[PDB]
């Protein structure tokens, strides 16, 4: 309705990656493709590997998720984020991955 700034103050360094994707849907990662795009841009991930990363969250494997967390942070630091946001971004992505629609 044009009654809340869709801000990204939680992830200031990741804002420039988050906006172009999530401004179409007012900041809420509703679709699966948006989580793949975030993953691919923020973490320097392959778009094809971002498809795999969605399935790993869907499967929610016990300790195999920590392999991706490490992978995500390694790329994340190389792009812009200070590795305080990258881990908490992964918390957001995994959380909205459960109800992510095609």
């Amino acid at each position: 309705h044009g009654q809340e700034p869709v801000s990204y103050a939680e992830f200031p360094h990741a804002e420039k990656y988050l906006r172009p994707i999530l401004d179409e849907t007012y900041g809420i990662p509703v679709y699966q493709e948006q989580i793949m795009q975030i993953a691919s841009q923020v973490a320097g991930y392959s778009l094809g590997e971002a498809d795999l990363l969605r399935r790993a969250m869907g499967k929610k494997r016990v300790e195999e998720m920590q392999k991706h967390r490490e992978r995500f942070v390694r790329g994340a630091k190389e792009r812009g984020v200070p590795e305080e946001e990258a881990n908490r971004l992964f918390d957001m992505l995994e959380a909205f991955a459960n109800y992510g629609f095609n």
Partner: protein
């Protein structure tokens, strides 16, 4: 800038130990000529202690009689367990390692020979403890996202050993060690 393994398993670790007593000491000798040291730490046993001591000293390497104890979750009478590296400070510590070993088999044997933090406190005199591998208590609570228990458990061990307790840090190609060693680095820094 030199190194000395304090957590090493020999052939006397009957299940998973593959390192023979002879060829191990010469590798440690050939790698580090200047004051070589090696610690025998085997899984819930002290079989090689005497043979390791007299062969190490025969090669000019200083032996450190260790013991990777299986520590029970609560009590040793409970019928899983946790890892914990213990190192002998002096001869009193050697006698205390011999007792903890003995009570592991005699009293607290369920699947492995297990010990307790009760009896560890009883025979803590002369033991340098380390935090242990991923299979140990504090690192396992960190993996469970229960930092309050990890720290609580850290306080319990610090009441036992005091200034003899240390934070064991080991790194292979494993993502679980990055989360643990990070949280252990904070604990290491918080409690002096």
């Amino acid at each position: 800038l030199k190194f000395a393994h304090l957590h090493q398993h020999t052939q006397f670790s009957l299940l998973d130990g593959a390192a023979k007593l002879q060829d191990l000491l010469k590798w440690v000798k050939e790698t580090t000529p200047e004051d070589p040291a090696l610690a025998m730490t085997d899984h819930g046993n002290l079989f090689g202690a005497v043979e390791f001591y007299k062969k190490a000293t025969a090669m000019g390497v200083k032996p450190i009689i260790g013991y990777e104890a299986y520590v029970a979750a609560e009590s040793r009478f409970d019928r899983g367990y946790f890892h914990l590296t213990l190192l002998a400070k002096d001869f009193t510590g050697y006698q205390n390692l011999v007792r903890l070993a003995s009570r592991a088999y005699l009293e607290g044997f369920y699947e492995k020979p297990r010990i307790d933090r009760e009896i560890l406190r009883e025979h803590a005199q002369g033991l340098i403890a380390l935090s242990g591998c991923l299979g140990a208590e504090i690192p396992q609570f960190i993996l469970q996202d229960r930092l309050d228990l990890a720290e609580a458990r850290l306080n319990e061990d610090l009441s036992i050993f005091g200034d003899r307790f240390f934070i064991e840090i080991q790194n292979h190609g494993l993502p679980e060690q990055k989360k643990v060693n990070q949280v252990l680095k904070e604990f290491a820094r918080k409690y002096g």
